Amino acid sequence: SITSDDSLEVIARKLNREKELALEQTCALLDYARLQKIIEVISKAPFIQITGLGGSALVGRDLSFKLMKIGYRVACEADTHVQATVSQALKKGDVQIAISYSGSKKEIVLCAEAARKQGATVIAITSLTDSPLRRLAHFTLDTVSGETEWRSSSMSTRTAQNSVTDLLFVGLVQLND
Amino acid sequence: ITSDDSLEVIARKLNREKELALEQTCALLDYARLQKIIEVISKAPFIQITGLGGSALVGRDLSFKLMKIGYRVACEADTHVQATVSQALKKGDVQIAISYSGSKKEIVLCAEAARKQGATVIAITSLTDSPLRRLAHFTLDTVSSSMSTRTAQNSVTDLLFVGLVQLNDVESL
Amino acid sequence: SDDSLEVIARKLNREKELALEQTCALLDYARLQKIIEVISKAPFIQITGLGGSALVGRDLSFKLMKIGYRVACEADTHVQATVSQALKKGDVQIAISYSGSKKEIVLCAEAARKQGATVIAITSLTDSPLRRLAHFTLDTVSGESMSTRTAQNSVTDLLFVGLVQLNDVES
Amino acid sequence: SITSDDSLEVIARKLNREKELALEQTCALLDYARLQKIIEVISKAPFIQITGLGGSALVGRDLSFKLMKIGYRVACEADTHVQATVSQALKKGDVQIAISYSGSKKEIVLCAEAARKQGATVIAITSLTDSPLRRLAHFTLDTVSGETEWRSSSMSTRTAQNSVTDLLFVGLVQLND
């Protein structure tokens, strides 16, 4: 989509269109009945681990700061060795929120498998493709990217992921009643 | 946007608010100015990216992209690490300061220290006349809610990056 | 310090050794056992610190996480601060600070005690805000900066080993 | 079963003893002629990546902040994916300081391979064992443990590493003073 022929303005406009598409298609895929039960699940979580890698870990930590900001016990950890040990020590009733577009990055898949072995609940924020991460998840929130993989690789994907976490957070706060 | 709403109404409302941030931010772009900014970033021996709170995550997000392509970058959530790095900047280096307000003490002092050291300061900030906007060599404006703000900030950094790759690609060829 | 590198290496090692000796000599093993028991029963544990003593806290955090304790240890102060506001009766805060009077650590220990949690300080001997606010204090004595870290790690490493022994004893 | 001793006071004394011997034996193993050459090479590095995992990464972070404060351009990154992208982008004349006791941690080994591939100069802070990391290093700084039953524990290993990093920092302040 974005090519070496483009002016800076066309690039600017192309980028915004990719994010707008990523937001709309992600939104269109939402099962609002399934979104609600997920929020219910997160809300009763004694402990929440949020896993990710690279740019998507920033999305997870963005959400971890917001959940801590309202009294949730949240682990979100960049060091993959440390992230893995947290997963291997989760307990039944805990919640893992796995943010990974591909669903086939080993470290993230290994952490989700460890959560399941320990009996934690796994929520995957991931792309529509059938992936090891999707097959490990109790619930899945689908993210549709709009990007040119060779140019805008961690941009509309991250916008799609941010839209899901933002919604999760607002729906959680809305459970103030 | 209010409670009593359903989750679908919230999702749409949040999506529209981001959509407005993307479009009102791009609407103020000065493409001749932005090109000069990319050139400056492109030639920088060293780049510091300052921020705090969510703007720090936006800074790290961009620093990962610049680091992958071999640009020498510092961007650090610890408030006083980030201050030691600004003061240690030298002439010709570049600081990218991301704050919506422009009056946050730490971002202001890091930007002071960076022009004290003779670096170029690029500010990604709101249209509010601010101490940051005054200290900056260049400003890219962001119009935005803390979600919309991060959305607006990311649209500037993402554009700077793809523009940087585009220019660097033109030269290599 | 216009000494050789060899003189520097030995001098740094002797400061570290003195920090270990002087810190170990102040240990009260009766209170340490009580402290280990408090930590072991906490549903949630926050470890606070700033600068190098934050790294010390995270070093402990990694080991506690691996054996199943729920532990927050954030090196960003505003994150650390809001994690203190959410503490609950029965939780535990481990506050690591040599001075004992750094505003950010003092503010988190107040919140912890306010919120009903137990505060365990790892701090120098001086009469300090952190020491007055703690339910339990473990002393660290330097050997002079680098030896301060060494002193703090010797207390945390001991807490870690005590806790592992506590479970293998009741296994 | 973590310890063969029953008494906390015995444990505390043995643990401190292990640390005292890790410090002294690592110190005795220093080729102070090499160490000055090593400090000289770090002094000239336009860019310094410090690599590690888990506890060893905290040592590298502690060093990275001391070095940044006296003005050096330093990368030190907990996220193993990002860290790997930094190693892959090093250039000739850059220095990588790889901090791993074992020398056989996949991610540290692959970061040193990438650094050497691209022509960076690799200084390893590692144990004496013949390791993939030691065979890849241009320079080595040996971290060994004490005699006790606590050898090779992360507590002993962190202590030996810290003494080496503390020394490198002080030797650098001495030039740059």
Side-chain angles (χ1 to χ4, degrees):
Chain A
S1 72
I2 290 165
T3 73
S4 61
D5 293 340
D6 293 341
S7 64
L8 275 168
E9 192 163 8
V10 170
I11 291 164
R13 300 164 61 81
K14 278 186 176 186
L15 282 190
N16 282 4
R17 281 190 308 260
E18 298 181 359
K19 296 179 188 170
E20 281 171 20
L21 173 147
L23 291 162
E24 284 174 36
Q25 288 198 239
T26 295
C27 188
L29 286 193
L30 280 171
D31 180 325
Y32 297 105
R34 216 173 66 230
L35 179 63
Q36 173 46 45
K37 176 79 183 113
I38 291 164
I39 296 163
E40 263 157 355
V41 162
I42 296 160
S43 65
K44 312 203 250 238
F47 187 45
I48 299 160
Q49 182 194 25
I50 302 184
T51 64
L53 254 201
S56 320
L58 302 179
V59 171
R61 208 192 329 259
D62 190 338
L63 180 58
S64 75
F65 292 158
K66 284 168 172 91
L67 296 169
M68 291 185 265
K69 187 57 209 184
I70 63 167
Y72 284 101
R73 274 69 205 272
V74 183
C76 179
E77 220 40 61
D79 190 290
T80 71
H81 180 91
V82 175
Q83 179 165 253
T85 66
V86 167
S87 284
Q88 286 152 352
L90 287 167
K91 314 209 216 312
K92 177 266 140 198
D94 300 352
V95 170
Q96 187 188 85
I97 289 156
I99 300 178
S100 185
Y101 194 78
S102 94
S104 64
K105 200 63 159 80
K106 218 190 226 119
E107 308 93 329
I108 303 307
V109 176
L110 276 163
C111 287
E113 200 193 354
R116 282 301 291 272
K117 270 160 59 69
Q118 312 287 117
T121 296
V122 171
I123 297 155
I125 311 187
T126 188
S127 85
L128 220 45
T129 75
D130 201 31
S131 67
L133 177 57
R134 190 178 279 273
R135 293 187 295 266
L136 285 156
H138 286 96
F139 307 89
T140 283
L141 297 154
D142 318 284
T143 55
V144 177
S145 175
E147 76 200 4
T148 329
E149 302 94 90
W150 33 289
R151 292 310 294 281
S152 38
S153 172
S154 270
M155 302 174 177
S156 39
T157 294
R158 165 249 281 141
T159 305
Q161 293 166 341
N162 270 323
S163 75
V164 173
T165 55
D166 290 342
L167 191 56
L168 283 182
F169 173 58
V170 176
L172 263 167
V173 170
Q174 212 202 3
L175 275 176
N176 43 35
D177 346 296
Chain B
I1 170 156
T2 84
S3 147
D4 175 291
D5 286 12
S6 82
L7 291 155
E8 184 188 328
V9 183
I10 303 163
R12 305 253 141 99
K13 261 145 142 195
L14 298 161
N15 272 11
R16 188 79 227 137
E17 264 169 17
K18 298 186 163 70
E19 270 190 273
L20 273 44
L22 289 186
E23 312 202 272
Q24 311 187 322
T25 302
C26 176
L28 306 166
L29 282 178
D30 181 332
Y31 288 102
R33 212 197 296 307
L34 164 75
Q35 184 182 7
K36 303 306 154 304
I37 294 182
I38 288 163
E39 275 146 16
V40 166
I41 291 163
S42 169
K43 293 157 167 187
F46 184 61
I47 298 152
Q48 188 199 18
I49 304 171
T50 55
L52 69 102
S55 318
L57 300 187
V58 168
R60 314 258 309 129
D61 193 316
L62 163 64
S63 78
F64 294 166
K65 304 182 158 71
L66 290 171
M67 289 185 326
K68 187 231 110 199
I69 59 169
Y71 273 88
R72 281 140 200 220
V73 198
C75 169
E76 190 63 61
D78 190 66
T79 322
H80 271 296
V81 186
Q82 175 176 262
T84 77
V85 160
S86 312
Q87 268 144 343
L89 277 163
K90 45 193 50 93
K91 43 211 152 183
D93 301 348
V94 174
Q95 174 181 112
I96 298 169
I98 321 182
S99 189
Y100 196 72
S101 97
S103 54
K104 229 54 79 191
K105 62 177 227 197
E106 306 90 327
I107 321 298
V108 162
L109 315 175
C110 284
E112 251 156 41
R115 216 162 69 53
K116 176 185 195 227
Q117 292 294 104
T120 313
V121 174
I122 303 156
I124 300 170
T125 183
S126 77
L127 265 174
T128 299
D129 188 340
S130 71
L132 188 55
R133 191 176 285 277
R134 306 199 260 274
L135 263 158
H137 283 73
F138 298 84
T139 305
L140 303 164
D141 316 286
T142 46
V143 199
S144 147
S145 204
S146 86
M147 305 159 172
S148 324
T149 294
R150 162 249 284 146
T151 304
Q153 281 157 359
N154 272 327
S155 89
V156 177
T157 56
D158 291 340
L159 171 71
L160 288 177
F161 181 77
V162 183
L164 171 59
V165 177
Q166 192 92 326
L167 175 89
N168 290 349
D169 276 357
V170 178
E171 299 294 291
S172 320
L173 260 65
Chain C
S1 264
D2 220 285
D3 322 313
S4 67
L5 282 168
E6 186 160 45
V7 171
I8 292 171
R10 241 268 280 178
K11 167 230 165 230
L12 303 178
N13 277 9
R14 273 271 85 187
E15 299 175 342
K16 274 168 199 158
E17 289 166 270
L18 191 70
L20 292 170
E21 192 191 293
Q22 292 178 331
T23 292
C24 180
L26 287 183
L27 285 173
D28 170 349
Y29 297 93
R31 211 207 302 120
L32 192 66
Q33 185 71 51
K34 167 79 198 210
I35 296 182
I36 286 154
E37 274 178 42
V38 161
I39 292 176
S40 83
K41 305 188 158 173
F44 183 60
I45 301 175
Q46 176 198 28
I47 299 160
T48 58
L50 298 171
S53 90
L55 294 184
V56 165
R58 268 176 78 68
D59 188 303
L60 178 51
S61 190
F62 295 178
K63 292 192 285 304
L64 293 175
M65 281 164 189
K66 191 190 178 311
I67 74 194
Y69 288 100
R70 282 83 140 70
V71 185
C73 184
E74 315 283 327
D76 171 274
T77 54
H78 192 46
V79 179
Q80 179 175 266
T82 63
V83 165
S84 305
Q85 326 269 45
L87 287 169
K88 316 202 237 264
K89 170 41 203 79
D91 291 343
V92 169
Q93 180 187 98
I94 299 167
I96 311 174
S97 183
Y98 198 75
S99 81
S101 49
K102 252 58 173 19
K103 188 52 89 175
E104 303 100 322
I105 313 280
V106 176
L107 286 180
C108 299
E110 297 189 46
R113 169 177 292 271
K114 170 214 209 225
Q115 301 309 318
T118 302
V119 175
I120 298 157
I122 297 176
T123 193
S124 73
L125 279 173
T126 63
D127 173 32
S128 85
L130 183 53
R131 182 180 290 273
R132 295 190 300 268
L133 283 156
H135 298 79
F136 302 102
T137 298
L138 300 160
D139 316 301
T140 61
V141 189
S142 83
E144 331 262 342
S145 197
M146 299 164 163
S147 54
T148 318
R149 184 238 281 128
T150 303
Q152 293 168 340
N153 273 324
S154 67
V155 173
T156 50
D157 293 345
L158 194 51
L159 288 176
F160 165 69
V161 176
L163 281 165
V164 173
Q165 174 201 70
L166 180 63
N167 292 315
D168 317 328
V169 153
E170 60 185 43
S171 278
Chain D
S1 79
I2 200 181
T3 184
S4 69
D5 297 309
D6 305 328
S7 151
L8 268 183
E9 156 156 32
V10 177
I11 291 164
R13 162 194 328 131
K14 205 170 268 165
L15 204 46
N16 280 2
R17 198 55 198 148
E18 166 65 24
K19 297 189 179 161
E20 287 178 2
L21 298 165
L23 291 171
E24 282 297 313
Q25 271 153 271
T26 285
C27 166
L29 271 186
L30 296 166
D31 179 356
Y32 290 86
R34 259 166 204 159
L35 180 64
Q36 229 172 303
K37 260 52 189 330
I38 285 174
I39 293 155
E40 202 217 271
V41 161
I42 304 172
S43 66
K44 299 193 185 284
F47 197 57
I48 303 173
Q49 180 188 32
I50 305 174
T51 63
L53 259 198
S56 91
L58 302 182
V59 170
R61 197 153 161 77
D62 181 271
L63 171 59
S64 94
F65 288 167
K66 306 211 244 236
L67 290 174
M68 272 170 204
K69 151 178 39 84
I70 71 181
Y72 285 95
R73 281 84 206 262
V74 185
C76 187
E77 193 54 52
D79 193 298
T80 338
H81 182 260
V82 168
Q83 182 180 261
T85 75
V86 178
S87 300
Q88 264 140 185
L90 294 151
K91 323 284 171 42
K92 177 183 266 95
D94 292 338
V95 167
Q96 179 183 94
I97 304 190
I99 299 184
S100 150
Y101 178 87
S102 85
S104 60
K105 208 65 192 57
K106 187 167 85 282
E107 300 89 326
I108 318 298
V109 176
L110 287 147
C111 283
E113 262 167 23
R116 273 268 276 214
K117 197 164 100 127
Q118 322 285 120
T121 46
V122 173
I123 307 154
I125 300 191
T126 188
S127 73
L128 281 174
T129 81
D130 192 27
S131 70
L133 178 60
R134 181 177 287 267
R135 285 189 293 274
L136 284 157
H138 294 95
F139 305 94
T140 279
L141 292 162
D142 312 296
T143 58
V144 300
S145 292
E147 70 101 342
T148 72
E149 77 162 55
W150 286 109
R151 71 177 302 279
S152 87
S153 77
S154 66
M155 304 90 77
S156 159
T157 282
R158 168 239 298 136
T159 300
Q161 286 158 351
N162 266 320
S163 87
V164 176
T165 61
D166 284 341
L167 184 55
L168 285 175
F169 176 47
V170 176
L172 276 158
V173 177
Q174 212 180 13
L175 305 196
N176 319 130
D177 234 341

